[PDB]
Amino acid sequence: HFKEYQVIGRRLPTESVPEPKLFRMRIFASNEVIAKSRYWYFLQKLHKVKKASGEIVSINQINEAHPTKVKNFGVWVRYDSRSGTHNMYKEIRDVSRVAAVETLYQDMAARHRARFRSIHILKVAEIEKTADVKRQYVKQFLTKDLKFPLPHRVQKSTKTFSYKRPSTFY
Amino acid sequence: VEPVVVIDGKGHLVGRLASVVAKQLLNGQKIVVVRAEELNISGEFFRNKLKYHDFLRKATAFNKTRGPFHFRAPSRIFYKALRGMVSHKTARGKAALERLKVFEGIPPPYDKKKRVVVPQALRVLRLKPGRKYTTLGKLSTSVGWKYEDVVAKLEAKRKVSSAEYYAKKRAFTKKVASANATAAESDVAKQLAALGY
Amino acid sequence: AESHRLYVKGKHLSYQRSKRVNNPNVSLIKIEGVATPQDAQFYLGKRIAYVYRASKEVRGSKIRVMWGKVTRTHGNSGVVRATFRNNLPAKTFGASVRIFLYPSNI
Amino acid sequence: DSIVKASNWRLVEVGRVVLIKKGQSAGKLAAIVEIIDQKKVLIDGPKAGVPRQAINLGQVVLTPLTFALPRGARTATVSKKWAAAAVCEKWAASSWAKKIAQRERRAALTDFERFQVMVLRKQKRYTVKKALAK
Amino acid sequence: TKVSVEGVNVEKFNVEYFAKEEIKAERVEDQKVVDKALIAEIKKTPLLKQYLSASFSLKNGDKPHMLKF
RNA sequence: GGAAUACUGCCAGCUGGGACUGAGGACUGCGACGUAAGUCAAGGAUGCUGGCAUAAUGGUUAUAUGCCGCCCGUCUUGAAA
RNA sequence: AGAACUGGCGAUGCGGGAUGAACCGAACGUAGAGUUAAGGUGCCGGAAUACACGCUCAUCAGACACAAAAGGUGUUAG
RNA sequence: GCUCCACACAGAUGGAUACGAAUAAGGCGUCCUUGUGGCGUCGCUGAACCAUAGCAGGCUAGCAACGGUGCACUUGGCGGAAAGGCCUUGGGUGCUUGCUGGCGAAUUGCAAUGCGUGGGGAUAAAUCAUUUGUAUACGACUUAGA
Structure with missing residues (x-):
């Protein structure tokens, strides 16, 4: 953490x-x-x-x-990789700055393979109003009356054998 | 928990199912596998077909018969998959394998007995939605299996009269539920409800 | 009347062993209905008895019993280590074993 | 004339009462306030007791019951809406809460209570068998 | 579960009482007295005598670490 | 305006479940309770119970089986070979 | 190919690494209890078919630095 | 295989408790115009259902049900994939803890669970012997003779 x-x-x-x-x-x-x-x-x-x-x-x-307040975080990140160092900007919809930076680090280690060793957090800021977000995947959650299902839930089994043929309905 | 466990292999992963069956066998549990032809393997059909060829292409020169043996039956394929997961060539491994039986479809008397499934080995529970998958029966038919037609023909008969048995069971449970309902609200029923029953 | 069982049946998996070395002095026992170490904590100190039939009759009976005790938990699947007065034959891998409720604390 | 069958899904949305499966507040009801992302949702269960926090959808399971709730409502407003909707009364009447209560009662049974249950079950079975075939 | 015992005399019994130096008559008389004293308390609650008479045994699905005694 | 909780660290705070060890051999000492007499968990365990002389139990052979173990001696080359 | 300085070997067992001379920990009286290193936790193999975020359908993927400069109406992020 | 004689005695202990199909869908009840129909209802694990009381489970007297259940019979049906098992009509004989009483437990002393061989009598078959080749170096094989 x-x-x-x-x-x-x-x-x-x-x-x-x-x-x-x-x-x-x-x-x-x-x-x-x-x-x-x-x-x-x-x-x-x-x-x-x-x-x-x-x-x-x-x-x-x-x-x-x-x-306990949901915020949209804009983070400016400068990181080094196998190639030359370059600047980067990303937007994260999280509740706290710590969670946002943790998610950013996880994404960098996942996508860009950049870890905590070669990642610099230049600035973390909160986006106040809508239409200031410049990332589509963040705008996705800003739509009014957003409702979606959770199809194909991965139910966990506590026993090896189950006489039910479980269904993944939600 | 059960002297013998009958596992329905339809819609199941060969790898996970074989691993769990072998692990249970090493624990001294008797397991019977049915509907092997309905077993599924992840990946597109061509990849599975190509994989089968490259393991049988290694026929020994001096002695092919004493060398690798290529079996086409889906049950034989499942046994081979599970055989490698057990420490064979040893008394402990040999004894464990004696507790496992693999059949195509549901031959009797297992057809008249309860069967179970392994949630962690279900194809519809592990594979990502929309991904390609391979069927063991089709692969066996492609690689030389010639009993798919008869297997399907006599499996259809298995569903026949078993639908009728289930209908009779439903009719009996109708009267059972009616008797339970008319027996409800009584002093004994009220006490059972208070006591969690 | 129908049942006279006063023990929890289990299975003997194998001795405490490494990748290439085994310690017969300690035996791993699987207890039915136990899935986590917390559940297995209740079974610690319970007597373990292995019942098998012998060809020869020695004390007027054809049943010989080897006693043991539960020492500590093992792994995260509820496996619990057990030590007996005499180690198991190593042919009982997967054999049924009996775990009694005494000495009881509840 | 049109037919569209078997399309009833428990959508995740604001005001969707949920039951926590894992964590400190496991088994305690909660209400979704605001959705953070596809994997994080803000929940508040002040009536139940769980404090307001952002929880992972994998640690919680949705429930059919639903009630209106303004987006991003605070704890006081969430509690007021929960009381007004009386979702607790609906929850108890459902077979899911009844099953939970029955399981808890069975887990809380005693040996003497178990013997009483056995005797009552024997009597009920005798009465049912007498009723049957007549 | 508990049954009233204040009405049953037990102070007489001690370590030397059970010493063994064809059942002793005094032991039978003491057992009869104890049974007479405790039968009323046992009957004070329904099904208590039947519960005591019935033996205890385990069944499939019974988890001692989960059962409440 | 007001408390509560999370986290960190402390308790010469309290109290349950499990496993091995019983080493020393009449007191000399450090200590605690107790006004005192005396007692104590204070430089290593004591008391009780159940099995036993057509005993309890223990010892040898092979097979029954969890795992490991290259064929011995001398000599080459820094080594194996 | 031949030389100069420097850390292990050699006289050296143990765990891990399908096995291992250039790899990691650890350098050794006979025993009991406990805690660990490297190395591992689907079976063989003792240990979670653990959690969370993303990535890949590969018709010889993947889990092992030279041929790697470039190509792809393959995909996810800047 | 039939008969007479001599001799030995890898792991149960509640119930493996029967549909199929989909998993971006399904069952159960009910209703109607009989449809890929309307309404209600359920999952979110088997933490489930039956059975589980009686000196390791005895003796015996009543009440209420006349049901539940073990037993050999008995009428019939189903089960050829490894059927070999599933039942079903009628009666008989026992239990019934469905309900209410009277008898015994002890000293076991605080626990070491508590069914072929080898010797004969008869009788079905096989080998060699013998002999033909259809087989042939030798093995081996096809044939004939109460």
Whole structure:
């Protein structure tokens, strides 16, 4: 289960430079250690700050404001694969940011074969109104009075032998 | 749970059914398989037909008879599929195979006894909808089986008079339900209902 | 009257073994009506008796019984490990075994 | 004159009361509020007790009963609509809830109660056999 | 299930009572007294005597880990 | 405006189900209960019950079978061969 | 082909890998109980026909880096 | 195979409890114009149905049903795929826990479940012998003789 963390670093302030830029970003990780490692990697890559002169001011966990509210999430993702790195944008209809990022990671590992090692979450934002969604598969669930069945349900059997010839009707 | 289990092989996967039957056999359970010709295998017919040829093409040069044996009956094919899943060439494996019987259709006295199915081996429960599948009977007929006509002819007779037996059972259950209904609302019936019966 | 059974019938699968090594001191027993380790937890410590007929009569009877006990659960299918005073012949693989309700706690 | 038979499906939609099969709230009724995707649906069962959450359709089984419900209703509105529709009364009358209750009662039976049930069953069978063939 | 026992005297019995040093007459008399004391309590509830007389045995589909005693 | 729950970590918190071990051999010590006498789960188990002399039980041969095991010695080459 | 430095072997058993000299763990008194590594959990084979998200019909798929630069009115995502 | 004599004694313990077909559909009841018809009703596992009380299941007296059930008979039907089993009419004989009573349990002491051979009598058949070739190196094979 993923979790959202906030990490800030200001590169061990020295003489003549008190309170540096104080780089701030949000990191999604399953634990504090992984969040700190990802923050260090992002600082090394995007910025010129390394752990040699770095410092973790504070790490905090951010909880989604409305864990029971359905939202459409627009995520900008930059990931690396066998080919060169390129930007990517996707839209996810989920309830919480953590679930949306988890689904994005699962899709990337499934379709693009990209795993957590080479995936960067640039930004996660909520789409407020309809007709701003640019993906058809997300617009699919926005239709008014959406009703559909669940044909051919895969019923589970607790016994090897069943004297019923079960039907998959729903 | 049952001294002998009769499994209806119609609309079942050869692989899963054979695996479960072998596993039950290794546990000391007697199982009888019926309607082997109706067994189904995933994939289009040509793929299954091509697969059969490449296993019989390996006929030994010096001694073909003592070498691979190619059986066309669907029951023989099912037994071969299940045979490989059991540790044959050993006393434990040989004893287990003695508990399994495979027949085409439902020969008596099994025709007059209850039969069961394996939910995890049903073709209509595992295969994705709309996907191609192969029938064991048609494959056997293509590869040399010559008893499909008689099998179907005497299986149709099996449904004949068994529909009549079911009709008689339904008529009897009509009177049984009427007797239960007229016996309802009584003190004993009310007590049974309160006690979950 | 119709039935006098006071035990839960089971099946002896095989000894606790690896891919190429087996430990006859521990036997795996399948209990009817048990599907999860939680259900099998109730059967722990129950006496296990294997009943078979012997050609020779020794104590005025043709039935010889080997006793055992339930040690711990095995796997996720309800299989439970069992240890007997004398290990099973290894020919009883799949043979029926009897599990009693004593020593009972309920 | 047109005929279209055997097309009754339990559609998944807002206001579709469902029964949870697996999870903490297994066996507790829930009402679908908003559909997230083909595999995730938001449910709320405040009358039953299950807290509002997004559940996987694989962990829940639909039920024939249905009731009107505004899309994306909150817990209070969902509970109000549940009370107004009186879906609980319909649920009990159905043979499915009766079967659940009978199974629970049988699982809760006692040895002495089992003996009483056996005696009552014997008496009922005797009465039925006497009634039969007459 | 329980049956009233306050009306039955049991303090007399002890470990030495069952010692074995053709049934002892005192044992029969004590059994008769206990039966007389407990028969009223047994009859206090319907079908209790029949339930006690009937033996207990298992049947197909019975799961002791699921049955309630 | 207000509490509850989820998660993390703690309990020198409480209490059930199962398996193996019984090692030491009159006290010397660390400890607890108890005003005291005395007691205790405190440097390793005690008490009771059931089977027994035409015994209980144990030992050898083959077959009955779960699994494994290349034919021994010397010598070549870093090894097997 | 011949040389310079460096980690295992050689004197070395065990588990895993259909078997295994260049592969992983683990380096060894006789025993009991328990927990694990690599390796595994449809049968042979002791262990879930576990969960969730997507992908592929392959007329010799798939579960093993050279011929791989390109082609396809095959499919799912940017 | 018939008869007389001598000798031995891989795993039950409730019931394998019978339609077919579809699985993007199905059963059951009922109704009508008799149709790929109308209404109700059910699945979401067999967690199901029968039977399950009696010194391992005795003796005995009544009530109510006259039904349920074991037994050898008895009339008839069905079952050729491995039928070999399924029943069905009539009576007889036992139980009936469907209902109400009277007798015994103990000491087992707290548990080690609790049906051919080898010797004869007779009689069906086979081999060799013998002999013809249709077979032939030798085996082997087709024939004839109370």
